[PDB]
Design a protein around this ligand. Sequence first.
Ligand SMILES: [Cl-]
Ligand SMILES: [Cl-]
Lengths: 268, 268
Amino acid sequence: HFISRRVDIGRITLNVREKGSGPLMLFFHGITSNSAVFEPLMIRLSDRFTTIAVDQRGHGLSDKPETGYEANDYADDIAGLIRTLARGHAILVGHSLGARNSVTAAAKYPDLVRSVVAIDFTPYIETEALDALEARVNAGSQLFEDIKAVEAYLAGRYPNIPADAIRIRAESGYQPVDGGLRPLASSAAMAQTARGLRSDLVPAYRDVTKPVLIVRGESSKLVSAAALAKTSRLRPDLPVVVVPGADHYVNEVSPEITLKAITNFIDA
Amino acid sequence: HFISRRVDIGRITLNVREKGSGPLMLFFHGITSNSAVFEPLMIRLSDRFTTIAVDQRGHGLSDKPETGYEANDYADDIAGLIRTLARGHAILVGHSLGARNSVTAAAKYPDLVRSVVAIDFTPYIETEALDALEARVNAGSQLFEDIKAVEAYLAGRYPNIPADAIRIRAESGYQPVDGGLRPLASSAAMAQTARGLRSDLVPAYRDVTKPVLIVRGESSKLVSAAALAKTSRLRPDLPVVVVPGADHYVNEVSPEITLKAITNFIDA
Ligand SMILES: [Cl-]
Ligand SMILES: [Cl-]
């Protein structure tokens, strides 16, 4: 149902998945992931919005520059893409890396973005949590024998993610290479992106003038309850949603509640 | 520049304050209060919304029937007001009694209401808290020498409410009588309304299908943090806003954060 195409936005070329019609709504995945993880959620909003998932730089079928993996880099990519699509301001739905990127974009390009749904990535994340993300970020950079081996690997790295979601990641983020399957994501891009995630995100949340819904997973190991509390104290006006039973991977682990939270937000 | 008028909705006649143009946005006050407390907030949304604050049954300059002060009665009034106004579904922004009435209405009349901003009134409010409220409301029915005495009394009863807001309550809630001033609100209505606020509100929050923004004051004595925590597990999808340095009287104590929270919600 979704058509894939690489879009030249000038500064770089990105791969995207499109479907539906109506106001623009862009989806941005987390580190090492890719645009496909959002198809289940998009089909649900396609009749009312033009849903487009974006493989961000260094990931999926998008360009993989030698460098430039900081917040600003990803943020400028978003502005470029919104301008290139020229379909009006966009609602940004981002998960982790995507969430950090969307809020940075919204704060720097007020006019290009209508609102943001920041799923599991706020300022104040503790060093230990980022140490963990950084240590296993390229644990996937290896040669898998077949798709079965990819799923085994994924199911083990993301124990709470549903088999269906595991299969989607397995089929979309790994391609047949000499001798087996390998990640589409560039290892150098990941390493640089991971340490870029340590930068101060306070200015971005403090200065964003557009609506931002903060979504946290109850048992998320990336965004702690203490981190969300400080964020809310920084911006008490930003609506908050805490998803029960969900860890860092909110949209994949709790698809229904995630959907309802988004529709409650944009339809109000 | 507000225009006040008594609107006959059939089942009863209510007084309302109107200003601005655009999508309909209705405001509902707390028990013993009246529509005037919202003027400062409405002034801020008049430019793009047709803002209308309502003196609910038994309050202000509205009809004060002898009986009928349960949630259903207050909720059916809201339905009639939206039908009589004939201007499309309305956004419901209610405080305490008003919030309780608004969610109730949303659950019962989904097509008449676009969304709801429920300020400080969730289910699970503990008994002792409802007892204290009831005690204060009934003790409010007394004679005051003059407006100065009224202002002193209200200030002592609501220590955190800013003087300008206290004055508004003093100038709008009373009537000249022999001996000085007395509340406009019907005492019988208040007693009955206070009692009705004890009814189970889980049903309404559980079945409401339209967007609802839950707003709590960090130090509210009516809506405890536990009550909010329980409300969020009942409906984890409903966005939440907790206002630091604000008690039960959120919109009057923290007007800026309140306005901002409202716009982040409806403009998403
Ligand atoms: Cl990430
Ligand atoms: Cl009340």
